[PDB]
Design an enzyme around this catalytic site. Structure first.
Site, PDB file in Angstrom:
ATOM      1  N   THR A 148      77.899 -48.778  40.435  1.00  0.00           N
ATOM      2  CA  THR A 148      78.091 -47.633  39.557  1.00  0.00           C
ATOM      3  C   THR A 148      79.366 -47.794  38.748  1.00  0.00           C
ATOM      4  O   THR A 148      80.467 -47.720  39.287  1.00  0.00           O
ATOM      5  CB  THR A 148      78.160 -46.319  40.352  1.00  0.00           C
ATOM      6  OG1 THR A 148      76.999 -46.198  41.181  1.00  0.00           O
ATOM      7  CG2 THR A 148      78.234 -45.129  39.419  1.00  0.00           C
ATOM      8  N   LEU A 149      79.210 -48.023  37.446  1.00  0.00           N
ATOM      9  CA  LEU A 149      80.362 -48.151  36.567  1.00  0.00           C
ATOM     10  C   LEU A 149      80.934 -46.807  36.150  1.00  0.00           C
ATOM     11  O   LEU A 149      82.092 -46.747  35.726  1.00  0.00           O
ATOM     12  CB  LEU A 149      79.982 -48.955  35.325  1.00  0.00           C
ATOM     13  CG  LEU A 149      79.348 -50.319  35.598  1.00  0.00           C
ATOM     14  CD1 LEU A 149      78.941 -50.977  34.297  1.00  0.00           C
ATOM     15  CD2 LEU A 149      80.298 -51.208  36.377  1.00  0.00           C
ATOM     16  N   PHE A 172      81.455 -42.316  42.577  1.00  0.00           N
ATOM     17  CA  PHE A 172      82.036 -41.383  41.615  1.00  0.00           C
ATOM     18  C   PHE A 172      81.733 -39.964  42.082  1.00  0.00           C
ATOM     19  O   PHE A 172      80.871 -39.263  41.550  1.00  0.00           O
ATOM     20  CB  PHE A 172      81.501 -41.660  40.217  1.00  0.00           C
ATOM     21  CG  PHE A 172      82.165 -42.822  39.548  1.00  0.00           C
ATOM     22  CD1 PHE A 172      81.817 -44.116  39.876  1.00  0.00           C
ATOM     23  CD2 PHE A 172      83.151 -42.621  38.604  1.00  0.00           C
ATOM     24  CE1 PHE A 172      82.434 -45.185  39.273  1.00  0.00           C
ATOM     25  CE2 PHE A 172      83.770 -43.688  37.997  1.00  0.00           C
ATOM     26  CZ  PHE A 172      83.411 -44.971  38.332  1.00  0.00           C
ATOM     27  N   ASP A 182      75.219 -41.459  43.640  1.00  0.00           N
ATOM     28  CA  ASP A 182      76.138 -41.769  44.727  1.00  0.00           C
ATOM     29  C   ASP A 182      76.101 -40.688  45.797  1.00  0.00           C
ATOM     30  O   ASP A 182      76.201 -40.988  46.995  1.00  0.00           O
ATOM     31  CB  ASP A 182      77.551 -41.938  44.177  1.00  0.00           C
ATOM     32  CG  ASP A 182      77.667 -43.105  43.224  1.00  0.00           C
ATOM     33  OD1 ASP A 182      76.904 -44.077  43.367  1.00  0.00           O
ATOM     34  OD2 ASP A 182      78.530 -43.056  42.331  1.00  0.00           O
TER      35      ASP A 182
END
Lengths: 256, 247
Positions: free
Chosen positions: A1-2, A109, A59
């Site tokens: 996950t960017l 995040f 997430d």
């Protein structure tokens, strides 16, 4: 996950005389687009523990699955009610997860609240655990749980973690946190706790663009974990100057 | 035999695996484990008669019945360590299935995967096969009950009632005298106590209450794994003892 794509806004958890009250609006936003309006952001880990999240839904779901399987393994190994994991244990687990992912620079995040009852002396709900049938949905009084037996914990993206009598994530950390630091008191009744939470949610609805007034309340008490019926919060403006027509203001200058 | 029974990866001139046969002997010499499908649920009982001379063991601390997802009973007859290993693998498979598909693993899929896991250890010349027979069972309203027994050679078979371990022939004979598809679990408890008292010669009215494990999945327990409470077990034990003393 960017980074975050589909996100949930703040969550608020507080202690009151009978346990934990946690509230979050049922909305997940894909940017400025409110794509999902009936999303569940509070999850039950076991009969005494709940998890709320603000941030990326993917997430949050990953963490929820991890916690679900941790609870299943705990239940498999359980022999007595004292063997069930506590909210403190789950908070430590989540904090360790976040710390390791920070070290790898592959974070979730999310900001997480782990709340629940840190005790087994108030009921026998964990004597026989039911995972697929909720007997709650036959009404006995709630038990006055000591504040020291309750647990609310916060974990952030960098693994920073702590606990308090009330925890907020997201935009709540400003509005709801100010109102709670002013007005929160110990041993509040259910209606008083709900009124305080409703004030905080109304301010959030007025001043936060990513929130809604479709609210989910969850109570962790001696009866177990109860999900309330989601309700629309009434939110009316607090001034008539807002409603005053613009054509009744002077036509010259900058009156907008 | 004749040098062909020293390894599990060699067939004898008559196409037999004597190591697996010896494992079967070991299992047959061990404690008794039975599962019975009833009208409203399944009852699993374990008779640990081998510990009738261990008078300092904590009462009821030794249990041979576990659950997988809180709705699948799994018991065993054989080596405690091997059975624990297999149960851990079953829990691991259930966890992986839930992680992959977000639903509980079906009972027949789990049984097949456990059979393959057990069978894998009967193939190489450097591993010891598991000496344990496994019983995996479940019950729900729509499908009624499903009971599977997995032998040490990796063969899984479906039953409506199964007994493994010592005295299993006598236990089966006593069980087959009635149809439990139309009997409730609460009524079947007394029958099982009578069967234990008649079959196992090392069991008496004094040690019945501390050498027997009783679990079930039934409508009363909400179709989830439960241990039968002493409040429910004691009257049945008393009735069975009374009847067998009468005759």
């Amino acid at each position: 996950t960017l980074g975050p794509v589909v996100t949930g806004t703040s969550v608020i958890a507080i202690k009151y005389k009978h346990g934990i009250m946690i509230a979050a609006d049922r909305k997940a936003s894909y940017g400025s687009y409110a794509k999902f309006q009936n999303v569940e952001r509070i999850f039950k880990i076991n009969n005494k523990t709940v998890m709320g999240f603000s941030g990326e839904l993917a997430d949050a779901q990953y963490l929820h699955e991890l916690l679900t399987r941790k609870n299943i393994n705990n239940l498999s190994e359980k022999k007595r009610k004292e063997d069930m994991y506590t909210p403190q244990h789950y908070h430590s687990y989540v904090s360790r997860v976040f710390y390791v992912r920070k070290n790898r620079i592959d974070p979730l995040f999310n900001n997480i609240i782990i709340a629940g009852i840190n005790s087994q002396k108030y009921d026998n709900n964990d004597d026989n655990v039911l995972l697929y049938t909720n007997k709650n949905n036959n009404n006995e009084e709630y038990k006055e749980i000591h504040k020291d037996d309750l647990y609310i914990g916060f974990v952030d993206m960098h693994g920073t973690n702590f606990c308090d009598d009330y925890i907020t994530t997201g935009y709540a950390r400003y509005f709801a946190l100010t109102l709670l630091r002013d007005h929160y008191k110990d041993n509040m009744t259910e209606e008083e706790a709900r009124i305080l939470i409703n004030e905080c949610l109304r301010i959030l609805y007025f001043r936060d663009a990513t929130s809604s007034n479709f609210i989910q309340i969850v109570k962790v008490t001696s009866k177990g974990v109860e999900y309330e019926e989601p309700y629309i919060l009434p939110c009316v403006l607090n001034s008539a100057d807002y409603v005053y027509p613009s054509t009744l203001l002077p036509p010259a200058g900058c009156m907008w | 035999s004749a040098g062909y029974d020293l390894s599990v990866s060699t067939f004898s001139p008559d196409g037999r695996l004597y190591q697996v046969e010896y494992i079967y002997k070991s299992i047959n010499n061990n404690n008794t484990a039975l599962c019975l499908e009833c009208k409203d649920g399944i009852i699993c009982c374990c008779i640990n008669s081998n510990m009738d001379k261990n008078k300092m063991i904590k009462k009821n601390s030794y249990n041979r019945i576990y659950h997988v997802n809180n709705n699948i009973i799994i018991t065993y007859s054989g080596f405690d360590g091997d059975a624990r290993n297999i149960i851990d693998r079953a829990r691991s498979e259930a966890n992986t299935y839930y992680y992959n598909f977000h639903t509980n693993i079906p009972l027949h899929i789990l049984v097949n995967r456990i059979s393959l896991y057990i069978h894998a250890y009967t193939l190489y010349w450097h591993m010891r096969p598991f000496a344990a027979s496994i019983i995996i069972s479940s019950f729900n309203e729509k499908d009624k009950g499903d009971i599977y027994c997995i032998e040490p050679n990796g063969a899984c078979y479906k039953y409506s009632g199964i007994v493994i371990g010592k005295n299993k022939e006598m236990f089966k004979t006593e069980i087959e005298k009635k149809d439990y598809k139309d009997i409730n679990v609460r009524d079947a408890i007394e029958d099982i106590y009578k069967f234990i008292l008649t079959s196992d010669d090392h069991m008496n009215k004094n040690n019945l209450q501390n050498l027997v494990n009783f679990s079930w999945i039934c409508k009363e327990s909400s179709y989830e794994f439960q241990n039968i409470h002493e409040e429910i077990l004691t009257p049945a034990l008393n009735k069975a003892v009374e009847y067998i003393e009468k005759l």
